[PDB]
């Protein structure tokens, strides 16, 4: 089916306590594959996935080189922005940047992205047409003008539609076992006494990949959305994800409730029932 490639960059100023902290990570779908930490000893882009470990020095030196460059331009951005907002020198601020591409089930270019955020709010984004920019702040205007005049969109479009996509499918083939896999959820339920007239039924989904998953409860086949406690999908640490959905059942009513699980690793959706 569909796939994505995304690079995440975070730069945080450390007024007085040295250079700004810079952290970069790259993902293919929900699998991280590289990282760069400015505070680390190597000072190199490093592998975070088994399949990319075999790339070759040409690859690693090249990516370490381009990630260092990103580090530097963000270091300058922190200054630039401080000015744009007439902000103090003693303040710690944050710049974030994300860019990447999506390809459909046919593995052809489908969508590209390129966006910045300053101190947690949108700053500027490349529109889907990949030819125009979306600026919020009045400050963002200055940047928008700069990029239109220097023709930044054109350069990113070419990269997002070509280079980005070619490497995505290269990784897909090279990391096929990891990236083109699917781990169906291992499900189970728990029953715990809340009181003398109520019980909590928690429906579990574990060890699944990718992260996308639909986990709901129904009472006589009817939506229980507003009466369901759903936790955020979390990482297990080994590359798979976990999630649960709980409902409070009035004693003697377990038979009315069904848990439904939808995940692409399942040959067909599940309907679990405490019984």
């Amino acid at each position: 089916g569909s796939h994505s490639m995304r690079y995440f960059f975070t730069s945080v100023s450390r007024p007085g306590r040295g250079e700004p902290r810079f952290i970069a990570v790259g993902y293919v779908d929900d699998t991280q594959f590289v990282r760069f930490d400015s505070d680390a000893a190597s000072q190199r882009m490093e592998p975070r996935a088994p399949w990319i470990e075999q790339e070759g020095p040409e690859y690693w030196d090249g990516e370490t080189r381009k990630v260092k460059a990103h580090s530097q331009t963000h270091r300058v951005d922190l200054g630039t922005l401080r000015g744009y907002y007439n902000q103090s020198e003693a303040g710690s601020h944050t710049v974030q940047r994300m860019y990447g591409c999506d390809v459909g089930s046919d593995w052809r270019f489908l969508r590209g992205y390129h966006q910045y955020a300053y101190d947690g709010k949108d700053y500027i984004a490349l529109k889907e047409d990949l030819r125009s920019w979306t600026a919020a702040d009045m400050a963002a205007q200055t940047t928008k003008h700069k990029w239109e005049a220097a023709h930044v969109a054109e350069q990113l479009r070419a990269y997002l539609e070509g280079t980005c996509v070619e490497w995505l499918r290269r990784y897909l083939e090279n990391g096929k076992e990891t990236l083109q896999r699917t781990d169906a959820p291992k499900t189970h339920m728990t029953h715990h006494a809340v009181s003398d007239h109520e019980a909590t039924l928690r429906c579990w989904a574990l060890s699944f990949y990718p992260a996308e998953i639909t986990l709901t409860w129904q009472r006589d086949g009817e939506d229980q959305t507003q009466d369901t406690e759903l936790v955020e999908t979390r990482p297990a640490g080994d590359g798979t994800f976990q999630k649960w959905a709980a409902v409070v059942v009035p004693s003697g009513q377990e038979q009315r409730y069904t848990c439904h699980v939808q995940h692409e690793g399942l040959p067909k959706p599940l309907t679990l029932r405490w019984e």
Binding site: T80, I124, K146, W147
Partner: peptide, 8 residues
């Protein structure tokens, strides 16, 4: 990784 410099 994009290989060209970009400054806000």
């Amino acid at each position: 990784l994009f290989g060209y410099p970009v400054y806000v």
